[PDB]
Structures are given as structure tokens and as C-alpha cells.
Amino acid sequence: PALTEAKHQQQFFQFRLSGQTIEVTSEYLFRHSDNELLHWMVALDGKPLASGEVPLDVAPQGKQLIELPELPQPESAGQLWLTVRVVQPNATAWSEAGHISAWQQWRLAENLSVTLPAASHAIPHLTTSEMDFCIELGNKRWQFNRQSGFLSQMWIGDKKQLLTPLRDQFTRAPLDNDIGVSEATRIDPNAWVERWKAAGHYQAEAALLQCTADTLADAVLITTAHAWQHQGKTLFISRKTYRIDGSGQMAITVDVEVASDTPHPARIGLNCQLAQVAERVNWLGLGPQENYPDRLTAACFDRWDLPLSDMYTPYVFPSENGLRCGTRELNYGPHQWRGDFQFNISRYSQQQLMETSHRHLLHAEEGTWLNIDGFHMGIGGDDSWSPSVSAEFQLSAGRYHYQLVWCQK
């Protein structure tokens, strides 16, 4: 996937958007844009509202001005995005016809949603017990284990959805860069992995501090708190609220506290193992390809739909992979999650990745493993034998907040 990030950064045409005028700059030194067309396009949260095509007449080291037609603008909420692509209409000796040589995208506008949902017809029922809290509404049921504080299971009808409880995740199966030159023999104490290892990240144990159910006028409200600790040190603290409403939608709200003195975590989010296994994945965010925070300029915001298989990157030396950032909506089977997050999804647990030396030895697991991150640390790469993640990409704030909406179709 890195290859794209290169391709885009090294592109020979450069853009600037000023109002509804696009300024094109050519980085060619000798040739004129003579097999180049510019395709443009506007879309609202994945929905296309407009397209153009314009032939480029820019000389090497030159500029070309492009004024766009009056752009539609809807009442509907959502983000409006402009996306442009340069195309090579004719084939060359090293390119096919219709090859895309460059691209760029901008966000044009946002119509924020000032609309409150339709007051639930129904109302969820909470059934208590000493083991757990159950929420029922319709065919749907959710169970939270009062001993662990996690949502242990959920049913749609008679079918269970989880194989594993939904839980907080602060680690990642180490990339090559996280490891560096650290070996079992000769440990590199500076390598991210080592730091994380040493600090207990990988083996910290949760601790129920609190777990309560409350009945709201039109919803149920669960509230929890855990502490992750290692050797009497509290590394992190997770505070959530789940709120299920008549719509049969759960809203998760999470708030982490990270100890100042612990290596910054690779990530901060949740994961769980789904029972289902679907053929496609559809999301509205950056893609289509694997993208990380310090590696996402080549990616575009849009609605992508791909086969599960494509959500895994077969790096010969298995590690965390396949992430997609800036996701606003993700759809898998009957599930739909909404918010602002980064995520990844495959048939391999982090642990399996982390414990397999070669990709050929991985085996697909029972269902689908889903990792949804409110936040993810960068991947680095300046070199692979010392920490290369720039500070801007390290999860060093201390306080982290995020929210989700899980639901069905």
C-alpha cells in the first residue's frame, strides 16, 4: 500500500483551490500537459452531485486556471467534497489509456445536522440479575456482564453476534518499525515494542471500578469504569456509557485517561470478535487502501466497498495492518457503526498476528475480528532501527474522548 502514498506525493501536477477556481501547477520541466485530462467531481457524503472534465494546457513549470461551474449545494446535511484526478487519455509506452497520474481532494462545505431523532415508538426493558444486565427491545437483546463490565453478548433474534466481548484495546501487533533491531537475545530497550512490553501494556489486567444500569425516560443507560494496571500501576482508565434507546441503537461514549509516565499507547479503541463473516465491507471514510495517520495523504474520502479479503495486507512478516482512517460509517453484515474513527477488520486477532513469523502460517479465526479505534499512533519509517514516529503522531495527550453508534439494518 505504501506505493500509493509515494505515487501521490511524487505526482507532477499540483493543485490549489481558491473559491471555485483550481490552480494547476506543472512540475514537468520539459513537457507540456499533452495527454492529460482533468476529471472533477463533487459529492456529498459519497453521493455524487457533479462532474466535469477538462483538458490541461499547462506548460512545464506552468500554471493553469480552472474555474468551475456553479456548484450545486444541497440543504441536506453532510460534507461536501471536491475531488480531482488527472488522466492520461492516451496510452504511452509505459502507461495504458486512462491511467491516472495525479489527484487531490478538498472539503468544500459542511452542513451540520440539527435534527433530533423521532421519539422512540417503544422502550427498552432492563432485566437485572446478579450476573448481568439485559436489555431487550424487539428481537434484539444486549447483555452486559456485571462482573467484567463488558458487553458480553448480543442477539438479533435467536442469533448471538459476538464470540468475544467488546473490550478496550490499547495495543497493537508490532510493526517492523515498532520492533526495530530488537531481538530476543539482544533487546533494544528503545524500540517501541520493548517500551510497551516493559511497561505491561500487553499484559495489563482490567479492573471493574463501576458498572451500573439506570432507567431513563426513553432509554437505558449503562455506565462502567475500568482501570488497567500492571504491578500496582494504573496505566489507563476507561470510562464509558452505553445508551440504548427506543430506536434500538446503542451509543457508546468513551473517555480514556493515560498515565503521563507510561509509554504512549499504540492505540486507543475497542475490539471484539464478531460471530458473522460477510463477503464485503463498506465504509464511508478514507480509502480505498490501508491508511495510517502519518500515511494517509494519498487516500480519499468516500464510500468504499470491498471484499473482506481486501481489508487485510499480507505483509510477509505479520503485524497490525489494514487500518483505514477517518471513517464515519462502517457496514458489515447487519452492523453499522457510526462516528469518527479509524478501524480494521479481518479474520486474525492481533495476538495471532503478533505470534506468527510468517504470513503463510496464519489461519483464519472463527468469525470476524473488529478493531475500532478512536485513536491510533503513526507508523513511522524514517528508518527501521530507531524510533521514527514523529511526535505529532504519538498518543501523548493523556485525555482521550470518543463516541460510537452501533446499530443494525
Epitope: A91, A93, E96, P314
Partner: antibody, heavy 113, light 107 residues
Amino acid sequence: DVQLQESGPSLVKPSQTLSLTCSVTGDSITSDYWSWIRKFPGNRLEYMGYVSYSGSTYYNPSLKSRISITRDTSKNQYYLDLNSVTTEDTATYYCANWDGDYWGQGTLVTVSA
Amino acid sequence: DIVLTQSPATLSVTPGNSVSLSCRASQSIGNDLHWYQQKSHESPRLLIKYASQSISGIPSRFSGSGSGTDFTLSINSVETEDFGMYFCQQSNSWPYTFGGGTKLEIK
């Protein structure tokens, strides 16, 4: 030295899946790229596809996603699966390495009701 | 996709004489053009690769030439064992494609 040989049904029914095996002897299947080529009754040759060392596959668009090429290192064989065949798929099928130096003897497969 | 056109479709020659077969691509394919011989009830046999590169085990009388869109396979002093079909194939772009073939027969 290397030897390739096709095996599998010579007669199949319309709509079924045509499956052929190419047995490689003399060297490992992990030591080359493997292909499938077929010749239609009218002397027309078509390159169906190939699988390279990483496992990446390349299929002829003419096959409209009906083709799958897989490998089995333990048996030192690779395969061709062509789904929903029609009379248009009647042809002589050959397996050969990507370089084109090694070819199987070819096997005629007739698709008839 | 790249279309390869071969001419003539059929060529008759008397053993001892020389012939040249043509293969033209719909678009430039550099030097990625290979030549195959095929006889009835037999698998294709690679004669020349990458337009003009020789193949071990092939008679010296076979030679190839060309680049871009126009290629030629020449047979210096045809032998009876040379009668059969000749196909060109390009590997410059996927999908690889074959020409329609030229039949070489005894005159």
C-alpha cells in the same frame, strides 16, 4: 528435468465447474510462475491466466470472473477452476510455466449437454 | 486489449526456400513479442522470445526481428519439420494475447 501434465475430466455439462490439475515433477511449484492456456476448435489461442510466486493471480478479463487458479505445494500441483461453463468453453487446455519453456501435453475438454 | 494481427494467414513454400511471417500489434509493445510453433495434436513450442532472442534447442534457421508494432519471424531454408502453425504472443500488457496464426504448408 521438469515435466508438466494436465489431468481431469474430458467431458463436462453446461453450467458446471470445469476443474483441471497440472502436476509438476522435477522441481518445486514455488520455483516458477504458472499458467493456463487454451486453444479453441478454430485454432484460436487464449491466455487464461497465471499465478506468480507471491500468490497474486492474473486472469483474462474474457473469463468474466469465472476463473480461479490455485496451488498446492505439498502435492506440487496447481489448478484451474472454470465455473458456469458453456459450449464456448470447449477447447484444448494446456498448463505451462510463465517462461513458456515447459508445457503439458494438453487435454481436450468438451462441454456438451 | 492488445490485438495481434498475423499475415499472411497461410503461406505455401517448397523445402529449401526461405520465408518470413508477419505479426503487428494494435499498439506499441516494445520488444515483448514471442513466437510459437504448434503442430496438430501438440502443445505450442517457444521459438523466439522478446522479438529476437534465441532459445536453446531451437534450430538456428529461426530468427526474429522487430520492435514497437511490427515484428517478423524468419525461417532460413524451410525444412519439412517446419510445416505447421505459427503464433505470436505479446506480454507487454495484461491480458497476454496471441495473434490469429499463420499456417506454413508445403508448396
